[PDB]
């Protein structure tokens, strides 16, 4: 009775200590202590050995550490499956995580927490392709996700240039109640601006200008659409830049220009000969601590700083040069 | 206290003949469609959802439709989950017909 459980906690306190030092057979002998005296190791004790190997980054050692769980017949703990999926996602196991996901699909356990940590862990390593596949498969059915995950993958996919994966997640996010705000649109506009075709980012912008309260355009949003129009490969594009400035000017008590807005306007107004319009804007840039280094950027994009210096000379404006 | 309790509640009789002409004229379906559309915001989305559900119905159990008019099937299914008996697929019978075809006026 009390003595039996009083003796049980004696090994129990040191049983997890065999996982404190990350022992492989030391924890086994502790289980062997009670297997000899007839003390069925409660699944929490059974799980402690699984933690011992998973803290050593033992891929198949942990699998063997769990392979005996079904052989004995004890149903593993919720923490048991949670611990393994964290390791497999951390190392990059693509199909191994789904193997556990089937187990809770048979043991009357929800996979939401396990699939959430599995998805998040896969992004914590550079397994970007794996992260999209796991999230999309689980969220295709009924699986609500925390808003933190939605922000992470939309930004992360757009960071590496995965608009196809990012757009699908955004469409999937809006299916489950959550409404896309200006932050999500800003992430999408990062890659749509660098796509050559201007009217793929404008369609996104018109979805925000005439949108609801939360999805209203931000100062970063106008920068992306301005950038997408000034580096088109063909056709006149200076008039559409005039509209965007006019809309930004009219909506001014909520939107204020920043360094990049003046930088892009200097570049756009100098490529086509609207030099006057540039000199004006240049001034604004002048009072920014970034200087013309960002306006120059690298030698790419036609070297806009070279344009401003050259075009000022060849037109007549020399004092401002 | 208000003396109109039953004067406004007396059952109108002779309604049995004004219960049938609704049923062969398609009146029940017409009066059910609007009640299903009484809560929808955009009717085009409702129509597209009905069409997609009917397409799924045709795909899953192909070898039944051609008579049942799966659009009627999905409409009856949606109307049958809140009372409103609405026999399956709004199918019409000929209870008194020792013949193949009605003249239909």
């Amino acid at each position: 009775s009390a003595a039996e459980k009083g003796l049980r906690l004696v090994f129990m306190e040191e049983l997890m200590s065999k996982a404190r030092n990350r022992d492989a057979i030391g924890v086994s002998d502790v289980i062997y202590d009670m297997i000899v005296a007839g003390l069925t190791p409660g699944p929490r004790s059974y799980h402690g050995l699984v933690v011992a190997h998973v803290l050593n980054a033992d891929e198949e050692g942990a699998m063997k550490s769990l392979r005996r769980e079904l052989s004995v017949g004890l149903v593993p703990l919720h923490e048991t499956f949670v611990a393994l999926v964290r390791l497999f996602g951390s190392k990059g196991r693509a199909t191994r995580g789904l193997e556990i996901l089937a187990a809770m699909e048979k043991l009357n356990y929800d996979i939401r927490k396990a699939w959430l940590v599995l998805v998040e862990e896969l992004v914590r390593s550079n397994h970007l392709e794996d992260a999209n596949k796991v999230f999309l498969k689980g969220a295709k059915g009924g699986l609500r996700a925390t808003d933190e995950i939605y922000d992470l993958m939309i930004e992360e996919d757009c960071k590496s240039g995965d608009h196809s994966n990012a757009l699908t997640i955004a469409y999937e996010m809006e299916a489950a109640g959550r409404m896309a705000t200006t932050f999500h649109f800003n992430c999408l506009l990062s890659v749509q601006a660098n796509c050559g075709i201007p009217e793929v980012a404008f369609a996104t912008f018109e979805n925000m200008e005439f949108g609801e309260d939360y999805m209203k355009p931000d100062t970063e949003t106008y920068n992306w659409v301005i950038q997408a129009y000034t580096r088109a490969e063909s056709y006149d594009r200076v008039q559409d830049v005039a509209e965007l400035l006019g809309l930004m000017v009219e909506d001014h008590k909520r939107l204020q220009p920043n360094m990049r807005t003046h930088v892009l306007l200097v570049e756009c107004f100098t490529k086509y000969c609207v030099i006057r319009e540039a000199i004006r804007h240049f001034r604004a840039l002048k009072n920014f601590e970034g200087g013309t280094r960002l306006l120059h950027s690298q030698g790419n994009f036609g070297d806009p700083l070279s344009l401003y210096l050259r075009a000022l000379c060849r037109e007549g404006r020399i004092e401002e040069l | 206290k208000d003396v109109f309790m039953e004067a406004k509640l007396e059952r109108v009789p002779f309604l049995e003949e004004q219960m049938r002409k609704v049923n062969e004229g398609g009146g029940v379906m017409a009066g059910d469609i609007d009640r299903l559309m009484k809560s929808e915001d955009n009717r085009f989305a409702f129509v597209n959802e009905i069409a997609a559900e009917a397409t799924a119905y045709v795909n899953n159990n192909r070898d039944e439709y051609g008579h049942k008019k799966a659009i009627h099937h999905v409409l009856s299914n949606r109307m049958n989950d809140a009372g409103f008996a609405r026999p399956e697929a709004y199918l019409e019978t000929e209870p008194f017909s020792p013949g193949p075809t009605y003249l239909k006026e």
Binding site: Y171 | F44, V47, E49
Partner: peptide, 9 residues
């Protein structure tokens, strides 16, 4: 009805 189109999750 050709405005948006259906998705169904």
């Amino acid at each position: 009805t050709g405005f948006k189109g259906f998705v169904h999750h």
